[PDB]
Design an enzyme around this catalytic site. Sequence first.
Site: not given
Ligand SMILES: O=C(NO)[C@H](O)[C@H](O)[C@H](O)CO
Ligand SMILES: [Mg+2]
Lengths: 372, 372, 372, 372, 372
Positions: B174, B305
């Site tokens: 992230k 996702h």
């Molecule tokens: O962006 C993401 N994955 O690609 C995830 O879904 C988020 O980081 C999670 O739900 C926590 O907010």
């Molecule tokens: Mg994401």
Amino acid sequence: MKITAVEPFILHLPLTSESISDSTHSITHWGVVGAKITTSDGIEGYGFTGTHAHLPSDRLITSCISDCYAPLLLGEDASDHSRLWTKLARYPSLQWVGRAGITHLALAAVDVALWDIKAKKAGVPLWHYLGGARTAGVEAYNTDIGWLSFTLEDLLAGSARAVEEDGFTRLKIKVGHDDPNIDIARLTAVRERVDSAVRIAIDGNGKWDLPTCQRFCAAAKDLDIYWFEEPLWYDDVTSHARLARNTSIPIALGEQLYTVDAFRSFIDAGAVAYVQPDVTRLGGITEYIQVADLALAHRLPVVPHAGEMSQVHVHLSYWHPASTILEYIPWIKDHFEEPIHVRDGVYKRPEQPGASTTPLAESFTRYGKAVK
Amino acid sequence: MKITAVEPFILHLPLTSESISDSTHSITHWGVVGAKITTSDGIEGYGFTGTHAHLPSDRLITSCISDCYAPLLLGEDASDHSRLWTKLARYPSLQWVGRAGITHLALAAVDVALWDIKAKKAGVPLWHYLGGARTAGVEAYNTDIGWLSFTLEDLLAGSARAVEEDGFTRLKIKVGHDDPNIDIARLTAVRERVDSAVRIAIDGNGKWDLPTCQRFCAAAKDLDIYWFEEPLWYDDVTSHARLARNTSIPIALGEQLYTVDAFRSFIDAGAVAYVQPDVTRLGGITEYIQVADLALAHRLPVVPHAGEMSQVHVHLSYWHPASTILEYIPWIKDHFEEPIHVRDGVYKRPEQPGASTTPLAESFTRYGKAVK
Amino acid sequence: MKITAVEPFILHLPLTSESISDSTHSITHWGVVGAKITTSDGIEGYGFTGTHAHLPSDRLITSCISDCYAPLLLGEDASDHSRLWTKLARYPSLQWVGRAGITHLALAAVDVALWDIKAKKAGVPLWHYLGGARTAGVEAYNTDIGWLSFTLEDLLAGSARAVEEDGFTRLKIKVGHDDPNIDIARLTAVRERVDSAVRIAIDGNGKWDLPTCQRFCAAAKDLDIYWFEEPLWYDDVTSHARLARNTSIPIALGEQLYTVDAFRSFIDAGAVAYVQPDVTRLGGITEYIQVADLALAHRLPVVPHAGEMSQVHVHLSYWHPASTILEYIPWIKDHFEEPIHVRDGVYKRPEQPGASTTPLAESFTRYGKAVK
Amino acid sequence: MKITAVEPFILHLPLTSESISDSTHSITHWGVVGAKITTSDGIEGYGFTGTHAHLPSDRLITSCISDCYAPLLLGEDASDHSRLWTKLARYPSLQWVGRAGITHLALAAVDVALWDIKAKKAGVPLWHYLGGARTAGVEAYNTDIGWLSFTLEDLLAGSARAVEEDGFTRLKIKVGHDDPNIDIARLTAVRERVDSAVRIAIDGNGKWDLPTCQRFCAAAKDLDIYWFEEPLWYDDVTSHARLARNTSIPIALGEQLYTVDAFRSFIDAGAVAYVQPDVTRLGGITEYIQVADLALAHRLPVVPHAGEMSQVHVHLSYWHPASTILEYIPWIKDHFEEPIHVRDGVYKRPEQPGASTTPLAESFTRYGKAVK
Amino acid sequence: MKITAVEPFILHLPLTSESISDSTHSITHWGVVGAKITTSDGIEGYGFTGTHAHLPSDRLITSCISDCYAPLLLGEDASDHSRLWTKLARYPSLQWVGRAGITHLALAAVDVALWDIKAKKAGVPLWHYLGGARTAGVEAYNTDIGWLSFTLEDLLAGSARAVEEDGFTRLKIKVGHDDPNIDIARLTAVRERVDSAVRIAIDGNGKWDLPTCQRFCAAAKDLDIYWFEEPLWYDDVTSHARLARNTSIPIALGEQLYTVDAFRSFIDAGAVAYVQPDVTRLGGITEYIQVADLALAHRLPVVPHAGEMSQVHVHLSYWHPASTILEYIPWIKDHFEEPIHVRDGVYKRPEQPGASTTPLAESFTRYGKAVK
Ligand SMILES: O=C(NO)[C@H](O)[C@H](O)[C@H](O)CO
Ligand SMILES: [Mg+2]
Ligand SMILES: O=C(NO)[C@H](O)[C@H](O)[C@H](O)CO
Ligand SMILES: O=C(NO)[C@H](O)[C@H](O)[C@H](O)CO
Ligand SMILES: O=C(NO)[C@H](O)[C@H](O)[C@H](O)CO
Ligand SMILES: O=C(NO)[C@H](O)[C@H](O)[C@H](O)CO
Ligand SMILES: [Ca+2]
Ligand SMILES: [Ca+2]
Ligand SMILES: [Ca+2]
Ligand SMILES: [Cl-]
Ligand SMILES: [Cl-]
Ligand SMILES: [Cl-]
Ligand SMILES: [Cl-]
Ligand SMILES: [Cl-]
Ligand SMILES: [Cl-]
Ligand SMILES: [Cl-]
Ligand SMILES: [Cl-]
Ligand SMILES: [Cl-]
Ligand SMILES: [Cl-]
Ligand SMILES: [Cl-]
Ligand SMILES: [Cl-]
Ligand SMILES: [Cl-]
Ligand SMILES: [Cl-]
Ligand SMILES: [Cl-]
Ligand SMILES: [Cl-]
Ligand SMILES: [Cl-]
Ligand SMILES: [Mg+2]
Ligand SMILES: [Mg+2]
Ligand SMILES: [Mg+2]
Ligand SMILES: [Mg+2]
């Protein structure tokens, strides 16, 4: 289940008249060229492409099925139609001479056969297999009354009969005279003869160039033309894109496009409003669905071309939610175990297991052609 | 077969850590929020969306399932999933308050359950049901080592363990500090710590604006960033299109997009290269497939996702031919009858009938929450 | 002043006829779904969304208000409507399941209540609070006479009456028959029946596709159509952009757009000429003003859709300088402490403090629905 | 002079190594698949396409020549190559199943044969026939040292030998590992091993997607890559246009394009900088010249792909003024009456009458395959 | 064979009327300004440009042929026309003062001469030399009846005679009064006088500006105008692109464009639909064929301008497959060894060896002008 045989076939089936013509072609028979694929449980699936019954090129298609694809199919699980699509389409040495034309047409036949097996094995018609009906009734439009070979008297009489006796409210008429003003005169006459509530599409079969089309479209402004199909050269995206912006008449095309790439190119360019995929031209049902889904994403109507005379497409049109209306040409239907059936301008829903691609035995006997 | 019952459920499942954060959210539990649908033959299908386990809003989703949708499902043939998708999605008074958000999340849960039923009835895993495998092995990438809440020391320790002990060669980390130079420092340290052959993607969860992203991407030019996910505000197509043109770093997005229309807007604009549909955000598998087909048409990779922690998407990535890699987050898998399973960076191919959405009985009991 | 209570409500109110229809919906009641917000000084603010009075989904909105948003409001200074808009809209776990749909509809009701409090506390009607009047008289257009459910006879009789007895000079008529030529015929008859100086807009409520709209708009070229509202699917920007360029008939839309982002997408694409924000669909007055400012910067007219039957938009149209004309439908007016009122085709300028959203106590009694 | 016989043939010629691979294909032989056309004066002309020597599909091409096209050729004046190109290419029932693929590859072989006749009748090599030489020497680039199947050691050895012993200053190296960083490593090593004035182009054979290419091209910024050939899927114009804008590395393609229309789509989109027509892929020399003229009009270089191992393209590159350099692969040259010959990185100018397509008589007996 | 002499010439040939005018020019004679090139075998080839017979500028073209180009031609092999085109066109100090204008018109005369030699040496007419006929008959359109200098009476008389007595069904009429409504009146009268199946194109000779053209084209909407030639300033691509988008009337141009680059600018901008290359304006046949191939790639029609009163273009239009119809002006044809001939609106196919550029011997003595 395992594939135990792949058997190509060619049928040359007679038409409503001895010969018919559009702008570009004159034909006496319709070619149904394809494969029968048998699995270890005894199920037989059928798939085919649609040709102008020129036997030497029909046999290129059947030879590709027997000599190129059959060895890649024998012994594989027929269930795996998506895996087997890639196996055949992208087989490297076949791809090298492929991606379009003969190899793709042969791929279409195989793919449709596998889907016919799938629905047969499930014991249900394909539209039901795929997830149920999107409409209470798929409306038909009649193309068989509209051939360019018809004299104006015969064009009018057939159009009138379709509407006044046979319950059609939608027709498609061919255009493509060297001078389009002859087409304008023909359409003008059809519009005076039939009720104003009759919808009338036109089809040029790729005859004209851009400037000729621009003039014709402006000249047709009062004739309430539902769509103009294949106005321009099949592979010329840019001309279609220019035309679409120059007229309010919608452009229809797709029957000559082999791939999802090509559909994408026309759709993205705004060069097509009525999208006409065809399981006989694209790589079968598997690629048709991809094109349909592309159309849906652009909220454009899916109106498949009757390369298979709607035997397969009646299923896909009953199911896929971007679908609207369905071309009708009655040439071959009576040669199938489940003929398409139109009454009061509406297609009946298929009822038998499969994709209604299984010809009658008697039709093979009478109209089958040798593959070598 | 006829639907005889629709019963909503909520599971709040704990995570790998007590709390995790990305740029925008901090959570302690993952919400599995969905529907168990029973048919007259005794088959039981499951489907769910994925939430941040905020109970009051989780119950909005379950109430839409029980109070809005269940009356439109009871007594219908569960086989007709395509028809039933339109029935629910386009029910006029629901559409009025819908097209996205809560109503669409509820629709997603229903649609997944109907596919679970369909595959269960067929006696096969969903990937096989859909037409077989496009690969011998779907590669995974590890998201769970990359949370923004990790100190640099912990970010490094986890990334190293994923790669050196667990056999991952693909990670996602992230980003989204207020000053992106902090992210550049973090990513630079990860890059110095792990082998150069490790692929590293990043995810901003929509925190930054266009200028901040332009500068960040330029600063990141030597870090071999695999994709930049959700760089910008979720519904802003144009900013994404401008960033995409400004950098060689690929843009990824999709996890927040409710509709095929939204996908089409982004794709057509050139605003996304890695397409990330999610059956829990879109209207289930039905709408996922349409988006996957759309991406295939554009020859773009589908990397869904993990809104359902990949329990469904393992099937979809095993089957759909535009698929490539698959997000791995191990938070909920042990609560399923068939957990996902990754070894040496590759997902195990599912084996059991259905869409691997069936939770263990004991997980309802321990982690379920009341719907009212 | 501090917010001390938030109390959701639902009213189901009857219409001019027992049932009305457009191209897409048929309804018998209008749902007024919202919140009453009380401050420590005793002032009570009202704000609401507008639904088709489907009780199960009305209750999703009210539960969002009471169970999700009330805890974020109690104790806060109601004055801080801008800060509180963000607090609610972007609350991370709710944004996760929002940005549109139910959570946004609920947000709208809260926002409008806060504005109603602000104007009440100031002692002045909202238009005055915001900066005074842009016009001495907001002209009305009558939608209630044009429903697609009316027979041609009744459509003609109502249109004539509005113009000849009630002093309207602007009407909007629904379109959206399967065959648009039926709408051409209806419109042509209206045009023959009423004086040439009557302005007539039309509204398809999203029913048709691009090629259908192209043909219709060409056919409508002599009917002097003021605008064509929601001609195409609500989320499909590109189709609208192509239609706008293909015809001289202006396009109108906005009633179904939840966000400033969606408005920016349509506006930037040249896909809308008459911009139709609605405080009941966007995030309340707060987001409305943003979109109206966006429209002003494009020098485009703001003509809000009567989601709240113009009880709030009368204020906003009296005030915002991009505003022009205002939709009139008289269904709910008599249920408010200050009914809108139209005389000689002009809206009365409101006078009571607030946003004229306060319903009569008797109308809760008689038409209130329990929220649980 | 009248055409008196058309006889197809297949040669399977062994390569430099037992097997070679690029990113997509592995082959052991090269397929020379064509037609010998005899005229009434006794002149025999040869033309052929280039295949991967898959006999069952080679025989589709021959069967098209003998069964579809010969009947349209026998008794025609061979001199009329432009008229005959149209007669065959646009023959209605063959166009129906053509415009690309097998029918087009067969057309290419016929067309080349008729050009060979023309230049043989005139007693001069093709390049002179067409109007003389544009250069005193066509430079070669060596592709045969760069196969993806080569270990790094062997890639280095061969590249070094081509440059240090054989006097090449231009090489092409295959790329297309699943991880492009392996290719970056390979290229990096080559760049270190050979002199800096060696030009190095690369070729992906359509293996990667857009985002993969964007990242590779950025990472290749210091390797001085001359061009990147077929970086993306062959029929995807848009991805190529987007890539070309994202990098300073020039894009090359054309070897898989069957038609002038396809070339025009890529050129107009700015999707190609190095235009690679191939007489064995397009419809022969006739269509090649169209495409070369189209490239000239855009002032882009023409660098034809060696589908005929440059036996024909040596003529076309000595003549056409848009031509620059010429691919060299020595697999088949010694099987011809006039082999191509490169000394010190320059092609010898052809001397014999014809298009240098005539195989040695002993070629047919030693390497010929039966057409049925 | 070696070139042994290059001798320029000027003929001033009288027209059908004492004077004729279009919107820009008035002329009494047509200038045939060129070169006779002799080879060592005794073959003499002729080529020329087309002027308004202004002797002082005609002599600039001749002096370029004799003083600039002959020294680059004497002793070269005439067969090498493509090499020699480059040698002259790109000779550094001549390119410096060329690329267009006088040097290019002189190049055109030389190039045509070398093609005439080539076809004469081969003993066949040019159209056959180049590869045979694309049509059994090239249709003519008559420009000589439409001069702007004609009174309405005479325009009508001549148009009527062309159609009723001479069997033309295609005419071109000049436009370009200061007030275009006079032209609308003229055309309106012509349309009334002649049969509706007569095709009528128009030509403005670059007289008007964009807005003038937009209004004219709108006012011409019912006159069935086939094309509008040179509507705007010759070098202004943008105005032409804007006009082409504003009207359905096709745009024609090319007679004033000296280069392939200019044609490509207009074609790529969508600024031209009917492409009008002219061997007397472009650099001869060599450059014409490039432009015709460029038009083919866009699927646009090639309709060459009669700068050489179609003596050469009859060959190029019988051969090139993008060709459609052919301009006819009979001013000079009787001065040639093979005049062009039109019967019933169709051109005779040329028979004599060469490019039909050879004037009768008595032409030089009777109509020749001294070059110094
Ligand atoms: O962006 C993401 N994955 O690609 C995830 O879904 C988020 O980081 C999670 O739900 C926590 O907010
Ligand atoms: Mg994401
Ligand atoms: O264009 C079509 N339907 O839409 C038809 O396929 C053709 O007209 C027939 O095949 C004859 O060539
Ligand atoms: O479009 C409209 N006004 O412009 C109305 O909102 C709808 O017709 C009603 O809510 C009934 O669906
Ligand atoms: O791309 C190429 N040259 O540029 C070659 O044609 C291919 O690598 C060979 O056919 C083997 O597939
Ligand atoms: O435009 C034309 N044909 O299309 C003619 O060349 C001119 O009208 C003549 O040269 C007189 O200027
Ligand atoms: Ca698209
Ligand atoms: Ca803007
Ligand atoms: Ca171009
Ligand atoms: Cl083919
Ligand atoms: Cl359909
Ligand atoms: Cl339709
Ligand atoms: Cl049929
Ligand atoms: Cl047989
Ligand atoms: Cl929501
Ligand atoms: Cl990937
Ligand atoms: Cl998990
Ligand atoms: Cl919602
Ligand atoms: Cl207005
Ligand atoms: Cl009201
Ligand atoms: Cl093929
Ligand atoms: Cl080069
Ligand atoms: Cl070779
Ligand atoms: Cl000049
Ligand atoms: Cl023409
Ligand atoms: Cl003449
Ligand atoms: Mg058609
Ligand atoms: Mg509306
Ligand atoms: Mg290559
Ligand atoms: Mg002219």
